[PDB]
Amino acid sequence: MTTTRTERNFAGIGDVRIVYDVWTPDTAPQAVVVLAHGLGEHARRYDHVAQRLGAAGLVTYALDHRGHGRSGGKRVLVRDISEYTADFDTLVGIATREYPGCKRIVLGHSMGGGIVFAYGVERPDNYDLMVLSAPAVAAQDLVSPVVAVAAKLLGVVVPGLPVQELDFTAISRDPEVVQAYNTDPLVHHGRVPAGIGRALLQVGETMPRRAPALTAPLLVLHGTDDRLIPIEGSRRLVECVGSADVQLKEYPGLYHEVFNEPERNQVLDDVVAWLTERL
Numbered sequence: 001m002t003t004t005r006t007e008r009n010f011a012g013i014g015d016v017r018i019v020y021d022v023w024t025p026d027t028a029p030q031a032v033v034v035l036a037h038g039l040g041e042h043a044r045r046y047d048h049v050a051q052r053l054g055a056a057g058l059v060t061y062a063l064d065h066r067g068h069g070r071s072g073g074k075r076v077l078v079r080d081i082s083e084y085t086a087d088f089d090t091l092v093g094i095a096t097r098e099y100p101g102c103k104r105i106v107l108g109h110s111m112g113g114g115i116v117f118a119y120g121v122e123r124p125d126n127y128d129l130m131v132l133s134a135p136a137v138a139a140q141d142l143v144s145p146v147v148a149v150a151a152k153l154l155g156v157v158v159p160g161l162p163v164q165e166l167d168f169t170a171i172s173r174d175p176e177v178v179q180a181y182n183t184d185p186l187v188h189h190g191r192v193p194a195g196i197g198r199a200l201l202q203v204g205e206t207m208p209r210r211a212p213a214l215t216a217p218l219l220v221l222h223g224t225d226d227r228l229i230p231i232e233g234s235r236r237l238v239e240c241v242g243s244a245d246v247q248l249k250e251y252p253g254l255y256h257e258v259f260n261e262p263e264r265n266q267v268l269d270d271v272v273a274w275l276t277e278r279l
């Protein structure tokens with residue numbers, strides 16, 4: 001298979017320029033995937049994911065969120081989760097109009113998994129399948145009470161205020177992945193800001209009450225040795241969602257970024273097998 005990338009943009013909320021990739025395989029389109037990356041990264045850390053999904057006949061749309069990658073906006077700035085979910089919704093609409101006969105898959109990693117979850121509970125009828133990699137759906141369990149207060153009280157007025165260190169050595173146990181993250185000029189190399197912290201707290205604080213609104217099938221992927229987001233949070237998520245077709249795949253010994261781990265091809269084969277049979 002050859003899966004070709006085309007780069008496009010749209011005006012996001014606040015008239016921020018949002019850049020996105022579309023990855024199109026040279027086969028009949030079996031479904032569309034709308035993909036949300038996580039904190040401080042960007043959609044070009046997902047080329048290999050899009051290429052594997054294309055080998056299965058899937059067209060992948062992947063945006064750089066505001067404040068990330070090639071998109072506009074102050075770096076890592078957000079004042080409400082709805083900014084991220086609104087731009088994600090715009091991308092879902094573009095994909096839906098371009099491929100109106102196709103099933104729609106929403107996929108997110110980490111912060112992006114929080115965004116996709118938040119999207120899905122708001123629009124539970126507007127997608128067919130959800131896939132989450134280590135989703136940030138319990139941020140209140142990951143930061144100290146002091147950090148949570150600071151983020152909650154300051155994340156609208158001073159959204160760029162740094163509140164929390166991120167241990168980038170925890171993203172992957174492949175040192176080349178860590179090095180490529182640290183040397184990427186489009187990655188955020190500073191601390192977690194108050195605005196993103198607040199936005200993720202908005203998702204986490206009510207996850208158990210909102211997750212019952214999910215109805216569509218869900219696959220969650222999580223490495224057991226993830227020190228950034230503990231795996232027990234994904235175990236709790238799958239107990240709270242409404243949908244009967246829900247599965248957590250735990251990967252023994254993997255770090256946070258399961259799609260970038262040495263075992264990534266097995267992880268991705270699992271994702272493709274789960275998706276394909278549900279189309």
Ligand SMILES: COc1ccc(-n2nc(C(=O)N3CC[C@@H](O)C3)cc2-c2ccccc2Cl)cc1
Nearest residue numbers: 038039110111112136139165166196197200228
């Ligand atoms: C204890 O320290 C930390 C624990 C988790 C994270 N965290 N990482 C991501 C994330 O999206 N990525 C990590 C690198 C790449 O794989 C994508 C999101 C978060 C997160 C955490 C709290 C509030 C808000 C957020 Cl957004 C950061 C520091």
